[PDB]
Amino acid sequence: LQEQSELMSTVMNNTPTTVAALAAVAAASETNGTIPKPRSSAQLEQLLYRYRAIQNHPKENKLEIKAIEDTFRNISRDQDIYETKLDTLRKSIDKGFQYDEDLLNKHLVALQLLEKDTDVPDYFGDPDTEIRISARISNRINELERLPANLGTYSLDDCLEFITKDDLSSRMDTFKIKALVELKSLKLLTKQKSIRQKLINNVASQAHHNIPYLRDSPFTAAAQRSVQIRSKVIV
Amino acid sequence: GDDEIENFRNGTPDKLVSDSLLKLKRLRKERILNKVLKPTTEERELYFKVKRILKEVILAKKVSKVPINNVRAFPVLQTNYNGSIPVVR
Amino acid sequence: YNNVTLKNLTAFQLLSQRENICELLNLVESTERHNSIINPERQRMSLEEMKKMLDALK
């Protein structure tokens, strides 16, 4: 039940000693399914730091201190292993390789595009695959709609304008317009679809009076000629 | 840790990078075609392992260009404030 | 498949027009469409039927 978010909620509510998660087998082990080895850089580790620093006062009501300290031992051991491996890795380098430039370009651009979830070109119907497109657009809409409205730039070209304490520079909004062109272009999609239908179903709906090589064929001219035959008058 | 980069640093550094980026691209296709949103713990672990290697050459070799291309801006928050004229009902 | 279109008529005429030019250059065989319709054993079997009709009618 997200104990690694329950610690964050108890920290941000500023009352963590008053509850202390009721560390028994019935409560502290029901959310764990040891502790699950936190994932973040420090956002789930500083919480463990503060949690141990608050639980130094009771020291016996909470039996889960030992598994947390075992994970501190694991973190210290992994850190010492990485420091020894970084000491050896800087000694295992060849004296000459002369890494190529125009492949370093491609690795940097490819890593940068693979960070922020966009498609990388290689250079090295069916409503199953219709929903898998219409579920990537809701991703982008509900990711752009969580940006703060007070978003603003600071380009490297405001130094040539000498902005005072209150001067209102003229390149402050080169990202918030761009973060609304996407968010409103991804909501006007089923309007340009309905305009493209009215375009194609009135250009292709003639198809034999505008295109020259179709209205000059034998069979099209014969069909258009034969539909215009006025019915025979008996007597 | 590293556990492989010591062994592969003895030869060329660059083959593992492309052989890992192709795996990232295949895993990204397999995440798109599965309606999953969070990345797995198998490519995240495989992501930093890429970014380490490209760091170390820049630490070690000092490759002749290491090109610089930036958008020359970055987003910052700016102060907001309500209007001072009161509301009319 | 009961009806014809402009695409069907154009494809039929283009196919039948390119099959006729490929017999001058002899880059297509077309021996199967020949011999499945000639079929000389069927021809002599039919001639034997005509001969038996001559015998039965005389």
Partner: peptide, 26 residues
């Protein structure tokens, strides 16, 4: 982990003789 310019991503990214041999003959 600095983003790259968009205008740089957009910047880095036997059938012959079978007729002749039949056209020479006929």
């Amino acid at each position: 982990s600095l983003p790259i310019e968009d205008n740089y991503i957009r910047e880095v990214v036997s059938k012959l003789m079978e007729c002749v041999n039949d056209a020479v003959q006929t």
